[PDB]
Design an enzyme around this catalytic site. Structure first.
Site, short mmCIF file in Angstrom:
data_model
loop_
_atom_site.label_atom_id
_atom_site.label_comp_id
_atom_site.label_asym_id
_atom_site.label_seq_id
_atom_site.Cartn_x
_atom_site.Cartn_y
_atom_site.Cartn_z
N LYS A 82 0.81 -1.20 0.00
CA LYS A 82 0.00 0.00 0.00
C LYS A 82 0.83 1.24 0.00
O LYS A 82 0.41 2.33 -0.49
CB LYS A 82 -0.84 0.00 1.33
CG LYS A 82 -1.98 -1.01 1.23
CD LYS A 82 -2.96 -0.71 2.33
CE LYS A 82 -4.23 -1.57 2.24
NZ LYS A 82 -3.88 -2.92 2.45
N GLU A 104 -9.97 6.49 3.81
CA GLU A 104 -10.65 5.42 4.55
C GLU A 104 -9.64 4.38 5.00
O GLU A 104 -8.66 4.14 4.28
CB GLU A 104 -11.68 4.75 3.62
CG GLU A 104 -11.15 3.73 2.58
CD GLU A 104 -10.29 4.32 1.44
OE1 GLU A 104 -10.28 5.56 1.21
OE2 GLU A 104 -9.70 3.51 0.70
N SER A 370 2.24 -9.60 -0.79
CA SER A 370 1.79 -8.21 -0.68
C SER A 370 2.19 -7.55 0.67
O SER A 370 2.27 -6.32 0.79
CB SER A 370 0.27 -8.13 -0.91
OG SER A 370 -0.46 -9.00 -0.07
N1 LIG Z 1 -9.30 -2.40 4.60
C1 LIG Z 1 -7.95 -2.36 4.13
C2 LIG Z 1 -7.77 -2.28 2.60
C3 LIG Z 1 -8.48 -1.21 1.93
C4 LIG Z 1 -8.37 0.13 2.14
N2 LIG Z 1 -9.28 0.81 1.35
C5 LIG Z 1 -9.99 -0.11 0.60
C6 LIG Z 1 -11.05 0.09 -0.34
C7 LIG Z 1 -11.57 -1.03 -0.94
C8 LIG Z 1 -11.11 -2.31 -0.62
C9 LIG Z 1 -10.06 -2.52 0.33
C10 LIG Z 1 -9.51 -1.39 0.95
C11 LIG Z 1 -7.20 -1.24 4.81
O1 LIG Z 1 -7.73 -0.23 5.11
O2 LIG Z 1 -5.98 -1.43 5.00
#
Ligand SMILES: N[C@@H](Cc1c[nH]c2ccccc12)C(=O)O
Ligand SMILES: N[C@@H](Cc1c[nH]c2ccccc12)C(=O)O
Ligand code: NA
Ligand code: NA
Lengths: 386, 383
Positions: A82, A104, A370
């Protein structure tokens, strides 16, 4: 904007302006000399790219089948792929003159990556997180706090990732003049699925050169786990035009497909529109249905439109792996190769191991590793036991 | 075998045979072409070397003095520099025909590094760990078991690191035919302080090349935290003969040097023979005193004899930082650069910060960022 029939910009008119502005800035900067110099420099010196491609010789020998290589995104700063996306978009934000990032998060991992990139670039960071997720991810929330970010509990709706995205879009409508909405996977309204894919494509470009170097040829199969789809898109994308390279996406089968406690949108969902995109979602009456995975990054009820597209044209196959299989793979990789994987990544490892057994010893699988499993230690301790 | 007067091999007869076999095997393999092919390969494809050299721009500009670069050993596989030594010694063990590794650990970080390297090379791994440390390091313990290692609590003595090293030594004497004792820092009887420093020196060699590329010169100062001394020796050693490069090692000041709770051996210890070596040790009627740091990697009561030597000849300077100052630097790095450092590494960060304020803007400090702080999140939270 579209990947065949999937994608689009299904938003209120109030978002059309922020989204047009982001599209224009990205088209300007994506090939810009100075933008790419700085991005490469951060990727190198701060994130630690390139990551290695690792031959899992013990694991390969134990299975007695195809060679299993691991693209080591577990080694990027932060412990997951990420970061590549958090840096690219944060830098774009900065080139756009923005001073704040919002994002988010559900698992917390994107929230941390966002916080790290916003700290690096001197930006204010606010992270929307459903209250059910905050409760369950106390250490990732703590990481975000140490990094200088503010975590905003979202108490609306189902108090989870879907609701944090909805609240983040509402904030962006009011604040986009100085705020960039840093979406965490290849989802959302155009231009987000494109941008996040482009920022993660480094993974596949590296892996392609590395496998050529190691084996003198392309792999027979590339295997990646699929939550929203960004790590998979990052490794898949540069091989999309190499037609002999099989692409396999692995979704969360959870407690099993017939259990109803899974997150396999491409396997079991249906076409729908949420979060500004037309894609596959798990839904009942057109409502988003609860989802589950032991791997918290795989628990999102949709999937990126570019995956829906690759599935539809049969360029990529999408399969599922259970919580129990992933867990077994997590333990196996740790004990066999001295690599503790993210539970997300462990899904792809579990499918690869199955797949390898059926192939011959001169065939090659690259798995996208990942992330690393430090973040998952508490969960694995509770579920596996001490 | 000696660094000036320091170091040596002061052990029972029963340890001579193992040490002399290790020393011959080391001579044989250290420059061996196959051994170095394999080492480099694992360091590159499994560990992730080289690690980058990072310019801490925001931190440098805030402080307003010298440029601060961080050598990012936080990005090695496992999150600390220990992996370099774990790989190199495990591979040695493998070339020697050994099938088993044992190793002491206190903080659990070396135990994890050894477990990872053992898993990698398909060896059995038994980790000796004081019962006291076992109870404070639940997650590192868990990590070690996930990696297929066994954790042997040690209940003798103070039930801490010194005792673990004692028990490991007793086991090795019985088992060396098929076991290598993979010591965790640049301490113990010859040839361990040498072998560990040689397997960490990769840090300095990279950092040297990287700072020349970045700034076109050598640094003015290199700063590293010093527990047993291994991360500091790895980064210092390739610059020892560059006479303008100042070398500063940073010891745990704990609750204050006045307080009785610290682990500053070079600064407040006395020279003595312990664990097979003449070096500086913190002592009370001459018994080895309890030690303390917020950074659990820095709490050994001794220090590597190559540091004692460097101090004596005044090639490196040794200072201390308190628990408080290290914790402030942990928070500052996190917020300002987006890097959460190990609490050990935060000692070096904290001193480089002080030093930088006093230096000129075209001077250069390299900090060895020896680890990441993920492992420290429980204890930083619990505070
Ligand atoms: N929930 C995970 C991955 C993620 C972030 N934003 C997302 C939007 C869609 C699908 C998965 C995600 C996180 O926040 O690390
Ligand atoms: N206690 C720390 C560091 C360590 C290992 N062995 C040592 C010997 C001497 C000094 C420090 C150490 C760890 O186990 O990770
Ligand atoms: Na999904
Ligand atoms: Na000490």
């Amino acid at each position: 904007m579209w990947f065949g029939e999937f994608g689009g910009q299904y938003v209120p008119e109030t978002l059309i302006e922020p989204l047009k502005e982001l599209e224009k800035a990205y088209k300007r900067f994506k090939d810009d000399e100075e933008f790419n110099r700085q991005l490469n420099y951060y990727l190198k010196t701060w994130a630690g790219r390139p990551t290695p491609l690792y031959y899992a010789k013990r694991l390969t020998e134990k299975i007695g089948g195809a060679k299993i290589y691991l693209k080591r995104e577990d080694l990027v700063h932060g412990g997951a792929h990420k970061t590549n996306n958090a840096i690219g978009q944060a830098l774009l934000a900065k080139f756009m003159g923005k001073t704040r990032l919002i994002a988010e998060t559900g698992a917390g991992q994107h929230g941390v990556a966002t916080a790290m990139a916003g700290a690096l670039l001197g930006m204010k960071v606010d992270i929307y997180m459903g209250a059910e997720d905050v409760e369950r991810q106390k250490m990732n929330v703590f990481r975000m706090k140490l990094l200088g970010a503010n975590v905003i509990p979202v108490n609306s709706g189902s108090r989870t990732l879907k609701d944090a995205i909805n609240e983040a879009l509402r904030d962006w409508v009011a604040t986009f003049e100085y705020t960039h909405y840093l979406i965490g996977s290849v989802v959302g309204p155009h231009p987000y699925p494109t941008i996040v894919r482009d920022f993660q494509s480094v993974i596949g470009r590296e892996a392609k050169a590395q496998i050529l170097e190691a084996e003198g040829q392309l792999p027979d199969v590339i295997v990646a786990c699929v939550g929203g789809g960004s790590n998979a898109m990052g490794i898949f994308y540069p091989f999309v035009n190499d037609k002999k390279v099989k692409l396999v996406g692995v979704e969360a089968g959870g407690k099993g497909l017939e259990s109803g406690k899974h997150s396999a949108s491409l396997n079991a969902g249906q076409v729908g529109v949420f979060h500004g995109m037309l894609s596959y979602f798990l839904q009942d009456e057109g409502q988003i249905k609860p989802t589950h995975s032991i791997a918290p990054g795989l628990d999102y009820p949709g999937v990126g439109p570019e995956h829906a597209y690759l599935k539809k044209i049969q360029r990529a196959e999408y399969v599922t792996v259970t919580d129990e299989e992933a867990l077994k793979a997590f333990h196996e990789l740790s004990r066999t190769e001295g690599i503790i994987p993210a539970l997300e990544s462990a899904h792809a490892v579990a499918y690869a191991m199955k797949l390898a057994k059926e192939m011959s010893r001169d065939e090659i699988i690259i798995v996208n590793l990942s992330g690393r499993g430090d973040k998952d230690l508490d969960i694995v301790l509770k579920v596996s036991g001490n």
